[PDB]
Structure formats: C-alpha cells, structure tokens
Design a protein around this ligand. Structure first.
Ligand SMILES: CC(C)(COP(=O)(O)OP(=O)(O)OC[C@H]1O[C@@H](n2cnc3c(N)ncnc32)[C@H](O)[C@@H]1OP(=O)(O)O)[C@@H](O)C(=O)NCCC(=O)NCCS
Ligand SMILES: Cc1cn([C@H]2C[C@H](O)[C@@H](COP(=O)(O)OP(=O)(O)O[C@H]3O[C@H](C)[C@@H](O)[C@H](NC(=O)C[C@@H](C)O)[C@H]3O)O2)c(=O)[nH]c1=O
Ligand SMILES: [Mg+2]
Length: 187
C-alpha cells in the first residue's frame, strides 16, 4: 500500500525513524498530552518504537502518519490507524495530535483523511476509537462528525464510526478535502 492523502491545508505521510524527535517533542508537550498515553522523551527510544511500528506497517498491520501543513511543508501533528479486526472489518484510529502551528481546520481535514485511508484505501467496514472522559471538545468533535457512543468505562467513552457515515459525509465535507468542482450560489 501507498497512500496519497492530501486535503486543502494539510497532507499526511508515513512516519519514518527520522520523525522520532518531532514525535517526542509533540507527545511530551504538556499542553497537548493531557489525555494521551505517556511516552518516552528519549529520541532513540522513540526511533526504536518507530522501527517496530515499521514491521507492523510492512505487514499491513498499522499505518502511522505525520500531519503536515501544506503552505510551508512544516509538521503539525500525528495520526495513526491500528488494531485491525474482522466480522466486520474494523480498524482503530488515534494517536491524534496537532500542535500550535496547525492550520485552523487541520482537525477536520486529518479526520477525514483517516476515514479515506481506512474505508476506501484499506477496505474496512467500521472504525473504532475512544476518547478520555474530560477531553470535552474531542467528544464533541466526533459526535458532530457522526460517531456513535457504543459505551464507556472509568476512563473513556468508546465510539464507532460507520463506513456509511463516511460516504454520506463525503459530499457534505467536500470543501475540506479539496477545491470544489462547482460552488452553490443563491439568487
Ligand atoms: C484532538 C485535536 C487534534 C483536535 O484538534 P483541534 O484543533 O483541537 O480541533 P477543533 O475541534 O478545535 O477543530 C478545529 C476547527 O474546526 C471546526 N470544526 C470541527 N469539527 C467540525 C465539523 N464537523 N464541521 C465544521 N467545522 C468543524 C472547529 O470549530 C474548529 O474551529 P474553531 O477554531 O472556529 O473552533 C487537538 O485538540 C489535540 O491535539 N489535542 C491533544 C491530544 C489529544 O487529546 N488527542 C485526542 C485523544 S482522544
Ligand atoms: C504512537 C506512539 C505510542 N507510544 C506508546 C504510548 C503507549 O505506551 C503505547 C501504545 O500507545 P497508544 O496506543 O495508547 O497511543 P496514543 O497515541 O497514546 O493514543 C491512544 O491512547 C489515548 C489515551 C487515546 O485518547 C487515543 N485516542 C485517539 O486519539 C482517538 C482519536 C480519534 O480521538 C488512542 O489512540 O505506545 C510511543 O512511545 N510512541 C508513539 O509514537
Ligand atoms: Mg503519497
């Protein structure tokens, strides 16, 4: 598989070992890491993590992306598809982080491109993810895009996002993915 994920103000490309420093700094930013897993601040350890990730990637088991800002080709975050299962075909996503240099709507763009990757490039039927209780605006983002709370525990709310909502959204969110081929005009 190779991916061609590009939206209006952002694009994605697969993580390499050399992204270790950017990732370490991102994930150890205390403004950003309130609701994600603790991870090493050691560049070589993060390089190690990426090396193992690359084996999972070579086997079609995981795809991990740096998010970039299109205007200056500068890195603005991460996102990951992982933990694949069957009956029905399901993928998780997460590791979803954008820094201060993000474009205003990078969150909308990157989510949409994740669902491009999962449902159309990779053929999944269903997406699973969770969000910490307390991460209020993230809950509110996913509900708005059409995710459904399946359930919960002491830490998380658990969601699914169906392929049907992705397709059904592709028209509605088309302005985020590219230049419109034609624009609505009212008389
Ligand atoms: C999670 C994260 C990537 C979300 O990015 P964000 O930039 O915070 O996302 P926002 O919800 O603010 O969305 C960006 C903009 O698009 C708008 N928007 C969001 N969803 C939209 C939708 N469905 N339709 C139209 N506009 C939308 C927002 O209102 C916002 O614009 P605003 O500046 O006018 O409010 C980011 O907050 C982050 O890195 N958080 C820390 C790490 C983390 O907790 N990750 C998630 C673990 S579950
Ligand atoms: C991606 C990555 C992970 N790790 C460590 C951290 C942890 O010890 C282990 C497994 O990591 P995780 O699976 O928990 O990855 P993480 O990036 O922390 O994100 C996940 O756990 C968080 C607590 C959840 O909030 C994340 N959920 C989301 O981001 C869902 C999104 C759609 O809103 C979920 O995807 O690996 C690293 O050391 N380096 C890395 O680059
Ligand atoms: Mg490409």
């Amino acid at each position: 598989v190779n991916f061609n994920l590009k939206a209006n103000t952002t694009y994605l490309r697969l993580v390499e070992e050399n992204d270790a420093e950017f990732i370490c700094t991102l994930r150890n930013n205390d403004k950003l890491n309130t609701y994600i897993s603790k991870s090493t601040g050691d560049i070589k350890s993060q390089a190690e993590w990426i090396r193992n990730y690359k084996n999972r990637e070579n086997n079609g088991e995981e795809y991990y992306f740096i998010i970039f800002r299109s205007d200056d080709q500068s890195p603005i975050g991460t996102v990951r598809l992982y933990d694949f299962h069957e009956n029905p075909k399901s993928f998780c996503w997460g590791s979803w982080i954008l820094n201060e240099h993000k474009t205003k709507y990078a969150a909308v763009e990157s989510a949409l491109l994740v669902y491009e990757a999962g449902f159309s490039t990779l053929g999944f039927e269903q997406s699973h993810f969770e969000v910490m209780k307390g991460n209020d605006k993230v809950h509110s983002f996913h509900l708005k895009m059409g995710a459904q709370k399946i359930s919960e525990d002491d830490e998380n709310i658990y969601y699914i996002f169906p392929k049907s909502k992705y397709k059904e959204n592709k028209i509605q969110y088309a302005r985020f993915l590219g230049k419109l081929e034609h624009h609505h005009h009212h008389h």
